Amino acid sequence: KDILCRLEHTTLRKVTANTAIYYDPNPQSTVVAEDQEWVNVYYEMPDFDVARISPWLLRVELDRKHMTDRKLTMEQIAEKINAGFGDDLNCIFNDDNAEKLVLRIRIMNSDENKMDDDVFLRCIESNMLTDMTL
Amino acid sequence: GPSSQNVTEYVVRVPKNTTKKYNIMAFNAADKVNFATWNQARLERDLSNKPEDQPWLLRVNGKSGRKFKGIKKGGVTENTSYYIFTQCPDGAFEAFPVHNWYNFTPLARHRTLTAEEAEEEWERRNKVLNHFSIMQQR
Amino acid sequence: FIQMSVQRIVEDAPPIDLQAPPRYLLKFEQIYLSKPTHWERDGAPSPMMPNEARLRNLTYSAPLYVDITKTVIKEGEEQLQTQHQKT
Amino acid sequence: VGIRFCQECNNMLYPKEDKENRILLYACRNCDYQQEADNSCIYVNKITHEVDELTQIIADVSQDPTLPRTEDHPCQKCGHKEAVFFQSHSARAEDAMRLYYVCTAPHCGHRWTE
Amino acid sequence: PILEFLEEWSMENLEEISPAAIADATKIFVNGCWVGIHKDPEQLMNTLRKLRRQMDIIVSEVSMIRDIREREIRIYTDAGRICRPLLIVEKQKLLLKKRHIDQLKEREYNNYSWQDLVASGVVEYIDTLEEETVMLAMTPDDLQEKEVAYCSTYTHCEIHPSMILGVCASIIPFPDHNQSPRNTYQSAMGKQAMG
Amino acid sequence: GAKKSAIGQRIVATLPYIKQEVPIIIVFRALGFVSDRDILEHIIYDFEDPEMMEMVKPSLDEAFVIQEQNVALNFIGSRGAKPGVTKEKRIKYAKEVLQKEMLPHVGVSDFCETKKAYFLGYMVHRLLLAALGRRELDDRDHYGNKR
Amino acid sequence: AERGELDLTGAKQNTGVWLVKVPKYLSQQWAKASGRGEVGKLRIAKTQGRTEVSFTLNEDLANEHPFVLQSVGGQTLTVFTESSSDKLSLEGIVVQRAECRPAASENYMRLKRLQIEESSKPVRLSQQLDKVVT
Ligand SMILES: [Zn+2]
Numbered sequence: 001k002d003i004l005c006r007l008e009h010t011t012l013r014k015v016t017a018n019t020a021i022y023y024d025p026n027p028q029s030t031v032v033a034e035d036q037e038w039v040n041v042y043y044e045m046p047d048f049d050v051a052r053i054s055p056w057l058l059r060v061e062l063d064r065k066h067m068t069d070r071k072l073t074m075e076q077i078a079e080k081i082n083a084g085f086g087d088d089l090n091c092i093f094n095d096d097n098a099e100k101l102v103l104r105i106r107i108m109n110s111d112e113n114k115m116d117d118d119v120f121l122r123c124i125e126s127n128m129l130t131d132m133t134l
Numbered sequence: 135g136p137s138s139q140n141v142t143e144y145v146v147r148v149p150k151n152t153t154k155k156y157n158i159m160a161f162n163a164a165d166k167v168n169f170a171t172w173n174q175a176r177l178e179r180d181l182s183n184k185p186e187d188q189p190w191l192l193r194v195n196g197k198s199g200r201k202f203k204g205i206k207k208g209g210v211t212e213n214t215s216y217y218i219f220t221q222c223p224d225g226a227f228e229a230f231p232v233h234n235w236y237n238f239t240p241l242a243r244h245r246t247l248t249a250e251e252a253e254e255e256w257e258r259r260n261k262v263l264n265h266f267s268i269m270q271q272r
Numbered sequence: 273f274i275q276m277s278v279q280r281i282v283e284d285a286p287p288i289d290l291q292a293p294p295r296y297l298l299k300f301e302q303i304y305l306s307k308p309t310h311w312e313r314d315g316a317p318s319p320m321m322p323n324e325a326r327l328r329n330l331t332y333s334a335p336l337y338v339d340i341t342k343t344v345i346k347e348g349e350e351q352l353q354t355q356h357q358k359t
Numbered sequence: 360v361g362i363r364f365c366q367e368c369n370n371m372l373y374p375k376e377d378k379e380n381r382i383l384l385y386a387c388r389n390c391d392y393q394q395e396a397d398n399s400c401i402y403v404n405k406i407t408h409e410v411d412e413l414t415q416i417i418a419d420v421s422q423d424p425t426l427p428r429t430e431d432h433p434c435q436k437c438g439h440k441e442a443v444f445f446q447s448h449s450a451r452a453e454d455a456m457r458l459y460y461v462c463t464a465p466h467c468g469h470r471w472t473e
Numbered sequence: 474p475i476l477e478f479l480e481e482w483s484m485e486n487l488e489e490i491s492p493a494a495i496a497d498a499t500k501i502f503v504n505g506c507w508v509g510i511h512k513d514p515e516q517l518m519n520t521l522r523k524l525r526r527q528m529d530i531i532v533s534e535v536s537m538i539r540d541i542r543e544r545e546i547r548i549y550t551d552a553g554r555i556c557r558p559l560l561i562v563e564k565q566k567l568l569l570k571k572r573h574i575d576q577l578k579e580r581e582y583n584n585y586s587w588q589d590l591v592a593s594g595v596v597e598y599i600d601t602l603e604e605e606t607v608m609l610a611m612t613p614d615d616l617q618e619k620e621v622a623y624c625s626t627y628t629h630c631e632i633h634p635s636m637i638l639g640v641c642a643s644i645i646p647f648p649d650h651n652q653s654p655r656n657t658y659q660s661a662m663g664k665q666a667m668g
Numbered sequence: 669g670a671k672k673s674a675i676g677q678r679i680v681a682t683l684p685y686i687k688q689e690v691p692i693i694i695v696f697r698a699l700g701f702v703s704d705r706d707i708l709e710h711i712i713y714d715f716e717d718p719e720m721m722e723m724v725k726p727s728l729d730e731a732f733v734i735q736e737q738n739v740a741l742n743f744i745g746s747r748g749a750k751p752g753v754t755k756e757k758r759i760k761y762a763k764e765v766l767q768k769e770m771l772p773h774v775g776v777s778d779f780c781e782t783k784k785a786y787f788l789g790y791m792v793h794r795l796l797l798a799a800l801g802r803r804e805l806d807d808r809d810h811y812g813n814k815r
Numbered sequence: 816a817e818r819g820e821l822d823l824t825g826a827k828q829n830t831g832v833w834l835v836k837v838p839k840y841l842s843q844q845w846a847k848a849s850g851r852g853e854v855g856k857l858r859i860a861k862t863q864g865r866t867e868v869s870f871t872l873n874e875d876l877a878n879e880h881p882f883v884l885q886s887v888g889g890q891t892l893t894v895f896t897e898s899s900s901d902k903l904s905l906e907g908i909v910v911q912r913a914e915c916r917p918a919a920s921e922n923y924m925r926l927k928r929l930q931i932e933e934s935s936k937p938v939r940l941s942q943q944l945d946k947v948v949t
C-alpha cells in the first residue's frame with residue numbers, strides 16, 4: 001500500500017474539505033475563535049512575516065479521512081506548498097490533534113510592502129487544488 | 135367586537151364610457167420604488183423608433199430622478215378582463231377596464247461604454263484584468 | 273391535413289398586393305376538394321376508381337379549388353370587388 | 360458567500376478593500392457605488408459539497424403514485440405511519456443508495472433520513 | 474381551448490407575475506411554451522385529468538405531465554405523439570366494470586362502441602411522456618388484488634400485455650417461450666411468407 | 669488559465685443566422701434586460717441558492733463590457749448572416765433575428781421580448797441544473813422527446 | 816406644469832384600489848347591460864380571524880362569485896389614466912389583489928363547451944364537392 005500511495009496521483013483537491021477566502025484585516029482576530037486558538041501561537045513569535053502580510057486570507061479545510069487514507073501530513077503539505085510557491089505565500093496550519101485540519105494561506109509580504117489582491121488569491125486557490133501535486 | 139363579525143356589502147357600478155382611459159403601471163418589487171420622493175413625474179412616448187404602437191418612457195424628477203421605460207404587455211386578455219375598484223363616498227364600487235398593461239423598468243444613469251469603444255475592450259476577451267479599472271478609464 | 277392544414281395554409285397566406293396607380297388585392301377564402309377525378313382524352317371528367325388508376329397507371333388525386341376575392345383600388349375612391357369561386 | 364446588487368443600478372456588487380480604512384467593501388463596477396461588507400467572506404468553495412439532500416427534496420413528492428410507500432417509518436413530526444421513500448439520484452455525489460423519507464400526510468411535508 | 478381554461482383557472486400569467494413568485498409556483502408548459510405558473514398543481518392536474526376523461530375541453534390525445542420534483546406541468550397537444558389506450562385505475566379498482574363489458578358484448582345493434590369507453594372515462598390514451606408519471610398494473614387479476622405490499626397506488630392497467638407486439642410479432646405462437654432474436658427473425662420472415 | 673480557471677465555465681448561446689457563439693448575458697441585454705438583477709431574476713428564481721448564483725458569475729463578467737441594449741443589439745448584428753454596412757442596419761438586423769428567428773415558438777411579435785427572456789432564462793436555468801447535477805441529462809432515445 | 820408632466824395628487828393621497836380579474840361571462844354580462852347603472856353587489860364578511868369576499872350577480876342581469884385575495888407584496892401596482900384632454904394622471908396605488916371564480920363545478924364546463932364552440936365557429940375547414948367544378 002505504501003507503493004500504491006507513492007504512485008497514485010494526489011492533488012490538494014483530493015484531500016480538501018473546502019476553501020474559503022476572508023478579508024481578514026487583523027491577523028490576530030482572524031475570522032472566529034476556532035482559528036484564534038492556534039493562530040496566535042504562530043503569531044506569538046512569528047518569523048519571515050513580521051515585516052508585512054497580505055490582507056486577504058485563504059483558509060483551507062482538509063478532510064481527515066482523505067488525509068488518513070493517503071497518510072498525508074500537514075507539515076509535508078505546507079512544505080510542498082512552500083516548495084511550489086517558495087516565499088510567495090505564507091502557510092499556517094493547525095496541529096493534527098484538532099478535530100478540524102486548517103491551513104491559512106496569504107501572499108508574500110514584499111508584494112504587500114497588479115491584477116488584484118483578491119482575484120490573484122482565487123487563481124492560486126484553483127491552481128493549488130488541481131495543478132499542485134502532493 | 136363588531137370587527138369579529140363585521141359584514142359589509144357594497145354595490146357595483148360599471149359606467150358605459152369614461153373620458154379617461156385606465157391603464158396599469160407595474161414596477162418590480164425589488165426595484166424598491168418610493169412614491170414619496172416623486173416630487174415631479176414626466177411620462178412621454180419614447181423616440182427610439184423615430185406613437186400609440188410604441189413603448190412608453192417614464193421620467194421622474196427630470197434627469198435627477200430615476201428613469202423608467204414602459205413596455206406594453208405582449209399577452210392579450212381576449213379571454214380575461216381586469217378591473218379596478220375605487221372607494222367612493224357613495225360606497226358603491228366602480229369597475230373600470232384596463233386599456234393596456236405596461237411594465238416599467240428603471241434605466242441606469244452612468245457613463246456607459248459606447249459600441250465603438252466596446253469593440254476595443256473585446257480584444258481583451260478573457261485577458262481582462264482588474265474589472266474595476268475598466269470604468270476608471272471611462 | 274386535407275380538412276385543416278390545407279385550409280389553414282391557404283388562410284395563413286398573406287393577401288397578394290399589387291401596385292404598379294391601380295392597386296390589386298387577392299385573398300384566398302375557402303378551399304374546395306372534389307372526388308378523385310380522371311379526364312379522358314376528349315376532356316370528359318369521370319370518377320377515378322382506385323383499381324382503374326392501378327391498371328392505367330394514373331395518380332389517385334382530387335381536384336383542388338379555392339375561392340379568390342379580387343379587389344382593385346383605382347385611386348378614384350371607387351373599390352371593385354369580384355370573387356372567383358372555386359378556382 | 361452571499362450575493363448583493365447595488366441599490367443604484369441593480370448591478371452585481373463585487374468585493375473591494377479600502378487601504379485608508381482597511382475594511383472590506385462591495386463596489387459596483389458600472390456605478391461606482393460602494394457598500395460596507397458585513398459577511399467578510401468573499402466566497403466559499405465546497406469541494407465535498409455535502410449539501411443536505413433533505414433541503415433539495417420537495418414535499419410534494421408524496422403525491423407521486425410511482426414512489427414506494429412504507430408504513431414502517433412513521434413521521435417524526437406528526438406520527439403518520441405512511442411515508443414515501445426514495446434515493447437522491449443527484450449527480451456529483453459519487454455514491455447514492457440511502458433512502459430519503461417524506462411524510463405522506465397532507466400539509467405535513469416532513470422529510471428525514473434514516 | 475386549454476390555454477383559455479388555464480387563464481380561467483387560477484393560473485397566473487407569466488407577463489403579470491414577479492420573478493420572485495416563480496420559485497414556489499410550478500411552471501406551466503403548453504406545447505413547449507411556458508404560459509404561466511400555478512400555486513396549486515395537484516388540483517389543476519386533477520381538474521385537467523377530469524376534463525380529458527370527460528372529453529369536455531381536453532381531447533383524448535392531449536398529454537398532461539406533472540413533474541412533481543421539477544415543479545413543472547407540461548401539456549402537449551401537437552401531432553406525432555405516440556400514445557396507447559390504458560385502463561384507468563382508481564383506489565386499486567378498475568373503472569371498467571361488468572356493465573361496460575356487457576354493453577360491448579352487444580357492440581352491434583346497440584351503438585355502444587370503443588369511443589363510449591373513452592367518453593365513460595374508464596380508458597384513456599397515455600403518451601410516452603405521461604407514462605413516466607403513471608403507476609401501471611400489468612393485469613388487474615393479480616396486481617390489483619391484495620397481496621404482499623408492493624404498490625398500493627396504481628394509476629392505470631394494461632388491457633392486455635400481448636399488445637406490446639406489432640402486426641408481424643402478433644402472429645408468433647408462444648413468443649414468450651422463444652429466444653428474443655428468433656421472434657425478430659420470424660417478424661422478418663412473416664413478411665416474406667406466401668399466401 | 670489563471671483567469672479562465674478562476675471564473676469557471678461561461679455560458680454562450682448559438683443563435684440562428686449567427687456565425688459565432690454569442691455570450692448568453694449579451695442576448696438578455698439585447699432583449700431589454702440590462703441590470704444583472706433583472707437578468708438573474710429570469711435565470712435564477714431563488715437568489716437564496718448560492719451554488720446556482722456562482723455558476724452565472726463568469727457569464728456576467730464576459731458580457732460586462734456591454735451594458736446597453738443597443739450595444740448588445742449591435743454586437744449580435746455584427747455576427748449577422750450578412751455584414752452590416754452601418755450600425756443602424758446592424759441593430760435593426762439583430763432585432764429582426766431576436767424578434768422572429770430566435771425562439772419563434774415562444775413568440776414572433778415585437779412585444780414577446782419578456783416572454784422569450786423567461787424562456788431563454790429557463791433554458792439557462794435548465795443548463796445550470798444539469799451542470800449542478802440537480803437534473804438528469806435528457807435522453808435522446810426517450811420517445812417522450814420524439815415525434 | 817407641462818403636457819408631459821404626470822399628476823401625482825392621487826399618490827400623495829395614498830389612494831387605495833383593488834385589482835380584480837374576472838371571467839368573460841361576468842364581463843360580457845356587464846357589457847351587455849351597457850352600463851345601466853348597476854350590475855351587482857359586492858359582499859365582504861370578516862370573522863374573528865378570517866375574511867370572506869364574494870360578489871353577487873344581479874338577478875336582472877342573469878336573465879355567487881366568491882373572491883380569493885392574493886398577496887400584493889410581490890409587486891407594486893399603480894393605476895394611471897390618460898384623459899382625452901392629454902392630461903395624464905395617477906389614479907392611485909393598488910392595495911389588494913383578488914380573483915373571481917365561478918361557483919358551478921361541472922355545469923360550468925357546459926358553458927365553456929359552448930364558448931369553445933363559439934370560438935371555433937369561424938375556424939374554416941375544407942369542404943367536399945360531390946361533382947367536379949366545370
Ligand atoms: Zn450600480
Ligand SMILES: [Zn+2]
Binds near residue numbers: 434435464467469
Ligand atoms: Zn408527518
